[PDB]
A paper describes a structure:
Bacteriophage Sf14 infects the human pathogen Shigella flexneri. Here, we report multiple high-resolution structures of the full Sf14 particle, including symmetric and asymmetric reconstructions of the virion capsid, empty capsid, portal region, tail, and baseplate. Overall, phage Sf14 appears to share some similarities to other model phages, but in different combinations: both λ- and T4-like decoration proteins, HK97-like capsid and portal proteins, T4/Mu-like tail fibers, a Mu-like baseplate, and a P2-like tail needle.
The capsid structure was then resolved to a higher resolution of 3.2 Å via symmetric reconstruction. Within a gp33 trimer, the trimeric interface is stabilized through salt bridges between Asp and Arg on neighboring subunits. The trimer is then anchored to the capsid protein gp34 by additional salt bridges involving gp33 Lys and gp34 Glu. The decoration protein gp20 binds the capsid as a monomer, with the capsid binding domain contained in the N-terminal 118 amino acids, folded into a largely helical bundle. The core of this domain is hydrophobic, while the external surface is enriched in charged and polar residues. This domain is also anchored to the gp34 hexamer by salt bridges, with positively-charged gp20 Arg residues 79 and 107 interacting with three of the six gp34 monomers at Asp 221.
Residue numbers in the entry:
A (entry chain S): 2 to 121
B (entry chain A): 2 to 367
C (entry chain J): 4 to 125
D (entry chain F): 54 to 263
E (entry chain E), F (entry chain B), G (entry chain C): 211 to 263
């Protein structure tokens, strides 16, 4: 994912899930501040997000909260953790319909991001 | 203590009376924009003079040749004015026998009926004046029926300016459109003085305001602020100012050097069609927002005032050739004690002497 | 249930705006009420005293200015007659017309008879 | 009321105004009563609880029973007031006494906040509430929409506090001094009978009270 | 430990500029008290309630 | 317009919390003398230089 | 040029609110130091060291 290729977050996450569906996996929880631009209306990503080949992520909680929600409405988690938990859902067979980012205000360490999930 | 239902022999109580007064809007009237210009004659003229300037072309010295400048241009225009007349009558048979609402067994008098009739007439004239002022602000003075009385753009030979904000597109430059609107007044004022384009009134409707305050650029800009203004605009009451006709506080929003006020004024005519004050004649797409930007009173100064309203005397037997008035009310009694007649007159016209400064604003893209 | 509605006031005789005032009743006619027929202010009457029906607006005769109740032979002022303005006068544009009645036709007939209608606000 | 139309001055034409409308309305009211008796058998030989050998007094029993009657009437009056604030005035037994919406021939307004939808529009619904307060009240005077008691229960309050639109906005709001609404106690005012301070939340110029 | 580690609790103080937030996110968190074996009992503030370990 | 719109400049200024930062972004701008027709002229401060419109 | 715009350094200086960060994020980087041609020479502070162009 090359830097500043997508003019907003909505079009960024549209091809982030598509890349994950294609077998591409990402991990940036250690250098999170270097890849997320501030404000969701800024071009995404701030810097190029490299691919990884050793993606082995097993979270300590049930990532699919309901059958149609990644987190309970109002749950706050680290922004880098949102992408990992989202990637966990696509791997296990859940499809992403809409990523909830309309009224969100923060991208850095903690953000209230959510996704509406679907089968297949 | 009045007769109970089902029985004429037992009694009940009549506690009171609830009333539903219609909503009335007076924002433009209360703005004080249109200074009063009482008039004696039925028509008033106006002189329009202007000149132009150009760049000198270099001409050689030895061949003694020069340039000249075109003379001035002086024209003249005239204005007709609208006449409003409203008649109401009081008759003994709407007083005799009829019971005063909210009271058990006391009867209506002539005084209460006359007071309510006069109040309704005055309210009707006030809302008509507000609608006329808003129409004059639009640049075209169209009567409620639809007849044209004074098209300011053809009279002064100017073209209407409209700006498409394109609020739907998340990548739209709100700053660019705001700057365009700001510089249009300075460029087209042509008063010979120094203009400050930031002193304007931007009046928009509900949809335009909703799309403007929810734009991703504006909200993301104000969210990353630690000023009291941003805190109030994001998590706080967006209802500063106000004293509107209906609501105690109008919605307004500060983004640049300008403010956007949401005006919900609307009226109905006899035909039943509604007349939204903040609207564009033609557009009705429901999903597009419209607005009207006009210069502030303290922009061209008090010496050059462009918002005036005229008033001329009614055609009565002793008011001829006198200064005009806001409203005339006359008392006439029917012969043979058959009733009382009311007449209300108002002969006015609101106009703008610089129609180019009246700029329209839309929320869709061109 | 919790909503007794006692009822609503009948329209008052305020449609009169100007009439040729005379010692007797000028532009005012008396009709013998039609049996089992209820009259109100603003209804248009025929020569016999019946409401104007669809297809016969050309013979509109007057505008009723009384509230006659058919069930007790009387009116709202206790007068056992129906009174309507037929000759020249002017009225508010508050007319009660039956189904299928063309307003323009009855307006033209009344104007020919001398009655003018002032456009009343909503 | 309507809008005047321009009229030719010489022709002397004019306009007119339609008359008003009058209706009448009736209400029944509810009557309830309570009976209690004192006999010289609950004060004869019975000791006052909490004391070793102290007999109870007729005045004590009288005051206790009167206080219980008064507080029972107080709580039922509070329940009836809350029922009236909801439009339909029904009893505890469930019998309807006055349906204001059918009585005045109006339609109940309901704002669906959709607090379970993360991209919902809280500001839009609050503005709808204010607009319904201002427009629908036909008093004919200047009205203020931000003068409403929004009394809610624990479920609605809890779902409203943690909505992404509100919580993220308040979290990003640094130095607001109103960090209390995120970190501090929400028991910031008011009191009912049993609770010293009641939950209340400030957003959009209105207060949500649980 | 589980309470102070929870993402909601940590986030409520991470984005706060109060000295209390600074002390509870970065500082000692062993505010005061003495249980007889340690010089300062560790306490946490998340509203009107104080969590004492 | 394109210079003040640019995401790099806007985001570099959107973090600074200083009256200048509050003034350049979502502010009046228009900080300058007259040119003959307008009271003030657009002026943008960035990198030590001033862009004057 | 590569160093001053590095995401780690740039986002470490963006998040802090001090006159130094504002000076070397949006302000002029020339600071001081003559060159014989330049009146002021580019200087950057990240750690205890200073980078001079």
């Amino acid at each position: 994912i090359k830097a500043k290729t997508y003019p907003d977050f909505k079009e960024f996450v549209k091809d982030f899930v598509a890349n994950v569906k294609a077998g591409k996996r990402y991990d940036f929880r250690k250098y999170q501040e270097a890849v997320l631009p501030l404000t969701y209306s800024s071009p995404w990503p701030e810097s190029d997000i490299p691919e990884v080949t050793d993606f082995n992520y097993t979270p300590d909680y049930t990532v699919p909260f309901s059958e149609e929600l990644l987190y309970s409405v109002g749950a706050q988690m680290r922004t880098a953790d949102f992408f990992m938990d989202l990637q966990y859902a696509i791997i296990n067979g859940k499809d992403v319909d809409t990523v909830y980012c309309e009224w969100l205000a923060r991208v850095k360490p903690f953000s209230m991001l959510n996704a509406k999930l679907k089968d297949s | 203590l009045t007769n109970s239902e089902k029985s004429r022999f037992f009694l009940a109580d009549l506690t009171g009376e609830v009333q539903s007064i219609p909503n009335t809007y007076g924002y433009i009237s209360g703005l004080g924009l249109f200074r009063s210009a009482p008039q004696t004659q039925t028509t008033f003229l106006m002189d329009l003079t202007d000149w132009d300037i150009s760049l000198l072309d270099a001409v050689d010295r030895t061949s003694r040749k020069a340039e000249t400048s075109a003379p001035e241009r002086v024209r003249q225009i005239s204005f007709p004015m609208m006449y409003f007349k409203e008649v109401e009558s009081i008759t003994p048979d709407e007083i005799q026998g009829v019971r005063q609402p909210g009271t058990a067994n006391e009867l209506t008098t002539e005084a209460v009926v006359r007071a309510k009739k006069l109040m309704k007439i005055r309210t009707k004239f006030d809302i008509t004046r507000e609608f006329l002022f808003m129409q004059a602000l639009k640049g075209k003075v169209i009567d409620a029926n639809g007849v044209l009385y004074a098209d300011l753009y053809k009279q002064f030979d100017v073209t209407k300016k409209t700006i498409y904000f394109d609020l739907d597109n998340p990548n739209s430059d709100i700053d660019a459109h705001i700057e365009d609107l700001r510089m249009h007044m300075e460029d087209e004022a042509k008063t010979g003085t120094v203009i400050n384009g930031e002193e304007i009134h931007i009046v928009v409707d509900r949809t335009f305001f909703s799309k403007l305050i929810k734009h991703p650029k504006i909200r993301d800009a104000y969210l990353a602020q630690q000023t009291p203004l941003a805190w109030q605009q994001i998590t706080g009451s967006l209802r500063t100012g106000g004293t509107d006709g209906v609501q105690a506080h109008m919605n307004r929003f500060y983004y640049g050097g300008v403010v956007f006020v949401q005006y919900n004024g609307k009226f109905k005519d006899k035909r039943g069609k509604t007349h939204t004050l903040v609207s564009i004649d033609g557009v009705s797409d429901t999903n597009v927002g419209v607005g009207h930007a006009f210069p502030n009173v303290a922009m061209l100064g008090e010496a050059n005032n462009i918002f005036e309203v005229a008033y001329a005397p009614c055609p009565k037997m002793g008011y001829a050739n006198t200064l005009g008035q806001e409203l005339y009310v006359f008392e006439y009694e029917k012969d043979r004690d058959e009733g009382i007649d009311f007449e209300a007159h108002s002969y006015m016209l609101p106009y703008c002497t610089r129609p180019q400064l009246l700029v329209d604003v839309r929320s869709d893209a061109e | 249930q919790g909503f007794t509605k006692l009822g609503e006031r009948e329209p008052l005789n305020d449609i009169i705006l100007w009439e040729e005032i005379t010692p007797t009743g000028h532009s005012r006619k008396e009709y013998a009420p039609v049996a089992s027929t209820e009259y109100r202010v603003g209804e248009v009457l025929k020569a016999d005293g019946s409401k104007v029906a669809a297809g016969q607006e050309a013979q509109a005769d007057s505008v009723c200015i009384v509230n006659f109740y058919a069930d007790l032979q009387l009116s709202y002022h206790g007068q056992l007659k129906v009174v309507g303005i037929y000759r020249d006068a002017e009225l508010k544009d508050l007319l009660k017309l039956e189904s299928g009645v063309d307003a323009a036709a009855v307006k033209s007939a009344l104007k020919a008879k001398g009655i003018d209608f002032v456009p009343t606000g909503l």
